[PDB]
Design a protein. Structure first.
Length: 264
């Protein structure tokens, strides 16, 4: 179709590899581009990890309030929130909020430690029928995004379906799915990604991703004006290891796939 050709054209313009998956809950339809191809998730991988914690809190009251100690040896690159809590520590709820809204990397690692490792997140993904998601490493290693390397990757459609299941679906309990939605709506890093390609009055809950090879990602749940929610995943990666990020590509992809929706 037209959207199809527009995304192909956008990819040519980008000079990289673009992946898109849009699920429209109004008519349960999906628009995809390289929807089944694997892309390095970078920080977008954090959503599944937090969801695993939320799921665990369903059978263990007060789990989110469990305080976790943060050691100086735990600190990795870019940990804006965690580095300020070496003495007080942080609860699993605070760690989840920090990793999602600021993309705090130590927070992700602490969550992984609690769960039992990256493999445990992959296991959670399988528990919600996501057979594509795979987390193999922690931060910062999971960001290598080497071409032809399967580690820490997933597909646009797989992540779109999982995000839908975790927020609007039944993968998590009501209190938990709402908590996830609330954390996402408060993200501080997505102003220039998916949000930048949507009407200013639409409500968005997103989680960005940035890695080697100029990997630029963003996944989100969108609440358009008087319209059922949408789930959108946009992954983008480039040829050279030191490529610069291209959020402009994400913004345009979002505009292209939601244009028709915003016009009616």
């Amino acid at each position: 179709n037209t959207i199809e050709e527009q995304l192909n054209t956008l990819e040519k313009y980008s000079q990289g590899r673009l992946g898109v998956a849009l699920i429209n809950t109004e008519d349960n339809s999906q628009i995809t581009y390289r929807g089944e191809e694997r892309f390095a998730m970078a920080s977008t991988s954090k959503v599944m990890a937090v969801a695993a914690v939320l799921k665990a809190s369903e059978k263990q009251a007060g789990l989110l309030d469990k305080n976790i100690t943060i050691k100086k040896s735990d600190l990795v690159a870019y940990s804006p929130i965690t580095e300020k809590h070496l003495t007080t520590g942080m609860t699993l709820a605070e760690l989840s909020a920090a990793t999602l809204q600021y993309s705090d990397n130590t927070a992700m690692n602490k969550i992984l430690d609690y769960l039992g490792g990256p493999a445990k997140v992959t296991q959670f993904a399988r528990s919600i029928n996501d057979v594509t998601y795979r987390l193999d490493r922690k931060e910062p290693e999971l960001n290598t995004a080497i071409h032809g390397d399967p580690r820490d990757t997933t597909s646009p459609i797989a992540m779109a379906k999982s995000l839908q299941a975790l927020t609007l679906g039944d993968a998590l309990g009501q209190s938990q799915r709402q908590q996830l939605v609330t954390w996402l709506k408060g993200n501080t890093t997505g102003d220039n990604s998916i949000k930048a390609g949507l009407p200013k009055h639409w409500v968005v809950g997103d989680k960005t991703g940035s890695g080697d090879y100029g990997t630029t990602n963003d996944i989100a749940v969108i609440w358009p004006e008087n319209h059922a929610p949408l789930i959108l995943v946009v992954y983008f990666t480039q040829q050279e290891q030191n490529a610069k990020y291209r959020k402009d590509i994400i913004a345009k992809a979002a505009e292209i796939v939601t244009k028709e929706i915003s016009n009616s």
